[PDB]
Symmetry: C2
Subunit: 255 residues, 2 copies
Amino acid sequence: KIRPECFELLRVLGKGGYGKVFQVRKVTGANTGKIFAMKVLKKKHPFIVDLIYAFQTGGKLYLILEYLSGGELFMQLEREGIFMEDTACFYLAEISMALGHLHQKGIIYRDLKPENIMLNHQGHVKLTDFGLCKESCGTIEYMAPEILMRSGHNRAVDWWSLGALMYDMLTGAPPFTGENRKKTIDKILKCKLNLPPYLTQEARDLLKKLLKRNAASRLGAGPGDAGEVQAHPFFRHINWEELLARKVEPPFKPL
Amino acid sequence: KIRPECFELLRVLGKGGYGKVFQVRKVTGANTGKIFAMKVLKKAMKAERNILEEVKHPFIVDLIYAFQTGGKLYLILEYLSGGELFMQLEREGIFMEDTACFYLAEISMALGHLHQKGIIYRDLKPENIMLNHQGHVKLTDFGLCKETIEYMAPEILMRSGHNRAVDWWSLGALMYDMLTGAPPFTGENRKKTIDKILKCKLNLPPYLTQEARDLLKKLLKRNAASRLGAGPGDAGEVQAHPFFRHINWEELLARKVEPPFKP
């Protein structure tokens, strides 16, 4: 049944990660004509991109993931920067739900860069489960706090990234950019978050609590996870059942 | 040549850590009647042996022989007659700034060497810290010790939890427990103690010199990124500190500096 020849290559969508991701028409099979995204590796949630087929062959693992028309519409809305606060609150809210579910299933994203945020024909968020996403007694009075809290491998990494993303959606750039990779990484680690004057009172409060250097105190790091972050006043206008239902109208649907 | 029975068991030293550790007397061989420490590990239960084998430092317990038997590993380490440093802490109650400074410097040098070798302690309790007949620091217990970006968290950006800064905090803690008779943070229970550490409100005793307190706030810095010693200078940044201004490193590495306690 389903094998690599069941597909014809239309265009390349990205080198994204290791392996190329192709757009594709299914030639044979039941879905003849239907368009998919096929991710090749050289070897159910409304906000998670559905996987359809998966097969192994001549040393190449194939992934036939649903195709998303507004698949790059986010990375373009941020180039126009037409993002207003209330506009961004929508995407951050759906992503927060996407992160919460990935967390319950014990998955951390780590990435969460605007280039990793896709949209569907309706305009809602869709994430993946990349190859950069990871999974999750003597006397402790002498060991560092980072060891006691499983650093860089717990789900607080994602909430920092939610902030960084939010920060970029409301200003035009990420919190700690530098003239080169070295200076950037250092400005990141050494911090000192600068919040512009236009950011609202709720926006800045959330930004300060997501971009807290101390992961332990970082918002969303508690056991309530996304419940902690969704409860922020910045999200007061969101109705989570209506959002989860995709019954909330996205301000930007790829026409 | 070396085998198990080349050793007669003289005393059980500690069941602490994986396996057991005996004091032994060698009977066969050349160096005969030489007293040692022997770590016995039931094979059935980067490495404790790999590390000890490679590391050749005066402030770290030397390894003499190593061999495997019937599902067992045998590390014959040098014997240390000075016991544990902090036993002398129980007695003295607390250490004077320079008494602690001596021991701390010795440990700094030991940690520095382990670091240049890509080895990080991760623990460093006040119990891995032994003393030899002379009265100098001996780092003892190991086990199997360790070793686009605009939106990533700083933890991920620096391997937080698996870098050199981890040991520098421990040094700090140790130091804090040396001057004041207690560890930095503790509570009526484990979960209470852990919380105290994670939300580290450092309480420095008023009777500390400015030097000591500058280093404790610099060593016990919650953010590993700027914790003193976290930099590429490593123990260099730590030893540079004016708290160590009266220390001569060439001398100290030569055991020519005298311990404030001769056991």
